Design a protein around this nucleic acid. Structure first.
Lengths: 98, 205, 80, 154, 126, 96
RNA sequence: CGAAGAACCUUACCUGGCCUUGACAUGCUGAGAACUUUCCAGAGAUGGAUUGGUGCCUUCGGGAACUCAGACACAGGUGCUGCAUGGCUGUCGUCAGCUCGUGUCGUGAGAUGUUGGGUUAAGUCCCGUAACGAGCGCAACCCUUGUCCUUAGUUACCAGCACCUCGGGUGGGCACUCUAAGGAGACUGCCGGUGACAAACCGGAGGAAGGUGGGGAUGACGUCAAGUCAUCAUGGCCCUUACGGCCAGGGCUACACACGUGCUACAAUGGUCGGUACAAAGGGUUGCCAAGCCGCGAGGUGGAGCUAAUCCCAUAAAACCGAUCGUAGUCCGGAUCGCAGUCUGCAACUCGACUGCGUGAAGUCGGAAUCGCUAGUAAUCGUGAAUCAGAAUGUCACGGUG
């Protein structure tokens, strides 16, 4: 859809917006020398943030097409747009071989 | 069925349309630039026919060589389009952009330039064959040694998907030594979608 | 599961709708869509309306239900 | 069917100095376990030298030629009647028929200590009371009931 | 001098074999020959081109082999020493061309192809 | 000196553009040394709606190439870097 | 089988909560810079507070930038049509064919070339001949593996040389292995026989390789209105106070049954315990995560080294050696299940993976039937990658023994 790319655009904003406090709240919990009173109130600040901030909510879709399945991260393309753009000599250094 | 005649010869015949090295952390951040440049430029240069848009990346900026067979339409009154786009190619591609324009002398021997004219004729309600018997002999008075043109689609009919096929000369396709052009430009008539394929065969070796 | 470094789990809005709702005692069921949280010995004997998926079902909290979460007491699928 | 098949050769037995035993060793190997099967064939070779004072190659030389048959059937159907024809076994083929019959009856011997199963097989066939010798002679008896079909619709 | 360099490759192995006059000195990777190849018939297969050309007692042998498999390195030495023996002359050329020792075995492993599961095995249909 | 590009008809044709254009200026630069090559296979499915056993597999290469000076006394190649970079060659400097 | 990864997200479906020029496009009217608000209510959506911020170019008039509201055209659609179609793939089949120009025969649809003899993996060639030619195909051109030569020596290499603490550790060397560039080599070339002595065929020498050396990519004119409108593109048709948007939980992982592929097993060519030997190929500065270190164990600390022939992933397993095990539903097999743990993630209830401890099933080689494979092949043993916070008995890929 087009309305479905648009709702997973703003997830990428809200993850990259906060992005620093959640490093600190997970720095407090991960220490064995940390006190649980400093841990328990640190648990409060995680769950009162909106949940669309973790990377697990983020879903790497194809950038030109939007199809979820068949994505590679050494490119930005889908499974079936990568073929049509490679036969036209665009992708540099890419050939067939055996 | 008939694997694409560029993808088997990248190497012994032709080369890429874009050369630049990139690390594994920026490789997918230069592709998304260079793929929405070509969708941008062809939508602007719908006239003043364009065959090839090459992109080099020298040290840290850019270089682009747009090829037209009619450069005077694009360079009009000393770059009123050249500097106007060069302001606005940077807005999609944050590096400073060079724009260079060559000529495509003998415009009837490159497949993109030919197949754009076929969509023009077949949307003026010209006959499907009188347009194409004349678009091959004109491209055989000068130049090539073989031409195939396939015209498939609705072809005016009711429920008809026929394929016109006309050939002249010699066209090999299982010889990697040869030199073949290829282009698929489409056409939107008042009913149906017609796709056109072109296989201009220049000289071999 | 849920290793003992990070010991307990309970939801924040559930806690203020229980710990303050202890101070005025059990005269109402607690209607809550949450199912990810456990029950606790701060909550022995309450009445919770756990979301089935299309309705809420009542829960009689006992003393020997303490470790298991709310999900084991709401249904999902019928199979009559 | 253009005739293609050339010949590949395996002949290697350095610790004993033999040639028939190496080809016999390949009929014992399962899934490329050669070093496992090598010490079992020698493991059933020394028990014969433990049993008989003669060199146990000659026990193996005698045990082949009382399991190896002479003639056998060949169900060549005329296309409307199922016939069987007793045919002369080619001299190259008749080695591998005994060695393949020998191993398959060793596996159903049902003893303990696996090299003792193959040990008892090579002892019997120097006499004739082996199950491989009884399987040899029974197929010999099948040819003479089949002998009417030797040349005629054959 | 009299040092003779011999190489030989079989089943992705590679053996440096040096050959010089000595008295039965067979050493491989600073190990004895009986110690290196543990319990196999190929302990004698490395001697088979040597005892064919009746020079089993007349040379030092220094072998360094890398890569390959267990019994693939033993074949690399056997091909390797035959190239080192023919640096002398072609008197033993006909004694080894006829023996079938000089030709490198070209039989290498084959790649997995799509649709199939092994190099040639394919799944069952019905 | 180390060089990275995508095809051997550039990167092994730009070393002579450096070996000749540095040994001319007096300093000794030895012969270039090859390295192992990056090879990355990409097996992609080819049909839009499914038919699994029709596939197509590509490969992207990366050629490496290492130079070696002896006596550093020339800043000539430091100015002649925009010349020696042509289209897709990257040069990290290790002036030994 | 789309799916190269369903805890939510993905996700379309279900139950509600909730929007109406809209989550998004352009044009219009007003409003304020954008921003930051660190707060409560509420499952959240949202609603209302909310210290603050007051830019920016200025013909100093304002403009552009963003954000809020109003209204109109509209936006939007994973709704129907793959028999309205383009694009892209399967299939016969890597099968040896399929057609045209001119000419002649036939009232015409046709036919001849393209048939005959020999031969070939081959419509590949030779001899014949109302046909003479040409194209597509086959072959070769490309890649890889196997032999040698030249150019090249760090992070790779150790024959010669000393050095050593005995580790190429070090000086050193450019012999080598290796790496990768550029070349030669193989053409029925040569010998004999065979054929019309003409294609070719059977033997022979030499040679790393012998008769397209082995493998791979490359699939003709076409067929099945084969498949896909849910990858994308589009003709038409319908919805547009919802067939469109927003947010919680549930669901796709339900379950007498039947069919398809796949893994372990059913044991003594084995099972355990204790030693000990040899690989290729690949990933890693949003990462690998060592030494030391604490844990029955999965791990926890710890932080090096590292932008890669350097550092890490990373210990190959089968084989071998010694011991016990005596063929027993078992020192076989491991399903189920109780209990106890660690890791990721806001979150392991429905619904994750592994670890400990305990329990121990069916199974004693498996009907009628039925499929795969001609040589580094079947059979058997491991290793890696893609997708990926987490999660492979599948997919793709590399080697051992044979």
């Amino acid at each position: 859809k087009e309305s479905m790319k648009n709702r997973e655009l703003k997830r990428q904003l809200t993850v990259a917006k906060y992005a620093k406090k959640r490093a600190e709240l997970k720095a407090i919990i991960a220490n064995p020398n940390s006190s649980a009173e400093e841990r328990w109130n640190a648990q409060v600040a995680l769950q009162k943030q909106p949940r669309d901030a973790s990377a697990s909510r983020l879903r790497n879709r194809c950038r030109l097409t939007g199809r979820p399945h068949g994505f590679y991260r050494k490119f930005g393309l889908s499974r079936n747009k990568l073929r049509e753009a490679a036969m036209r000599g665009d992708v540099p250094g890419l050939v067939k071989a055996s | 069925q008939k694997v694409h005649p560029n993808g088997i010869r990248l190497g012994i015949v032709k080369e890429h349309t874009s050369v630049w090295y990139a690390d594994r952390k920026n490789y997918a951040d230069y592709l998304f630039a260079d793929l929405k440049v070509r969708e941008y430029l062809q939508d602007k240069l719908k006239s003043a026919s364009v065959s090839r848009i090459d992109i080099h990346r020298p040290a840290q900026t850019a270089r682009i060589t747009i090829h037209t067979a009619r450069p005077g339409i694009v360079i009009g009154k000393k770059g009123e389009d050249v500097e106007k786009l060069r302001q606005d190619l940077t807005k999609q591609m944050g590096v400073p952009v060079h724009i260079n324009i060559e000529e495509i002398r003998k415009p009837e021997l490159d497949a993109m330039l030919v197949a754009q004219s076929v969509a023009q004729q077949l949307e003026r309600r010209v006959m499907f064959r009188r347009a194409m018997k004349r678009a091959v002999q004109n491209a055989m008075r000068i130049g090539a040694k073989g031409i195939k043109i396939q015209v498939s689609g609705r072809l005016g009919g009711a429920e008809i998907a026929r394929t016109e096929w006309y050939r002249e000369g010699r066209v090999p396709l299982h010889t990697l030594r040869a030199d073949i052009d290829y282009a698929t430009y489409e056409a939107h008539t008042t009913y149906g979608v017609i796709g056109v394929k072109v296989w201009i065969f220049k000289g071999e070796v | 599961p849920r290793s003992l470094k990070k010991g307990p789990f309970i939801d924040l809005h559930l806690l203020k709708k229980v710990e303050v709702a202890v101070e005025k005692n059990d005269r109402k069921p607690i209607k809550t869509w949450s199912r990810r949280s456990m029950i606790l010995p701060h909550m022995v004997g309450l009445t919770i309306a756990v979301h089935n998926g299309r309705q809420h079902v009542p829960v009689l909290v006992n003393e020997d239900m303490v470790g298991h979460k709310l999900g084991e007491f709401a249904a999902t699928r019928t199979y009559r | 069917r253009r005739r293609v098949a050339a010949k590949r050769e395996v002949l290697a037995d350095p610790k004993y100095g033999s040639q028939i035993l190496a080809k016999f060793m390949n009929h014992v190997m399962e899934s490329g376990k050669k070093a496992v099967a090598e010490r079992i064939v020698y493991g059933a070779l020394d028990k014969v030298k433990e049993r008989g004072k003669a060199d146990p190659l000659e026990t193996f030389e005698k045990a082949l030629d009382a399991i190896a048959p002479l003639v056998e059937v060949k169900s060549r159907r005329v296309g409307g009647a199922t016939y069987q024809v007793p045919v002369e076994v080619r001299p190259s083929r008749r080695n591998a028929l005994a060695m393949r019959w020998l191993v398959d009856f060793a596996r159903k011997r049902g003893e303990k200590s696996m090299a003792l199963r193959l040990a008892g097989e090579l002892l019997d066939a120097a006499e004739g009371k082996g199950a491989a010798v009884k399987k040899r002679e029974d197929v010999h008896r099948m040819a003479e009931a089949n002998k009417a079909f030797s040349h005629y619709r054959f | 001098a009299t040092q003779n360099y011999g190489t030989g490759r079989r089943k992705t192995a590679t053996a440096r074999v040096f050959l010089r006059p000595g008295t039965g000195k067979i050493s491989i990777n600073n190990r004895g020959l009986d110690q290196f190849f543990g319990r196999e018939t190929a302990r004698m297969v490395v001697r088979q081109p040597l005892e064919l050309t009746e020079t089993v007692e007349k040379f030092d042998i220094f072998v360094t082999v890398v890569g390959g498999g267990v019994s693939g390195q033993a074949g690399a030495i056997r091909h390797g020493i035959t190239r080192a023996l023919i640096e002398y002359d072609e008197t033993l050329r006909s004694s080894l061309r006829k023996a079938g020792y000089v030709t490198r075995d070209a039989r290498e492993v084959e790649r997995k192809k799509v649709g199939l599961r092994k190099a040639r095995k394919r799944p069952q249909y019905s | 000196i180390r060089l990275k590009a995508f095809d051997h008809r550039l990167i092994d044709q730009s070393t002579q553009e450096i070996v000749e254009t540095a040994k001319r200026t007096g300093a000794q630069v030895r012969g270039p040394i090859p390295l192992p090559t990056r090879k990355e296979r990409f097996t992609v499915l080819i049909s839009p709606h499914v038919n699994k056993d029709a596939r197509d597999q590509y490969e992207i290469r990366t050629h490496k190439r290492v130079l070696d000076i002896v006596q550093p006394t020339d800043k000539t190649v430091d100015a002649l870097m925009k010349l020696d970079l042509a289209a897709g060659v990257e040069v990290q400097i290790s002036l030994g």
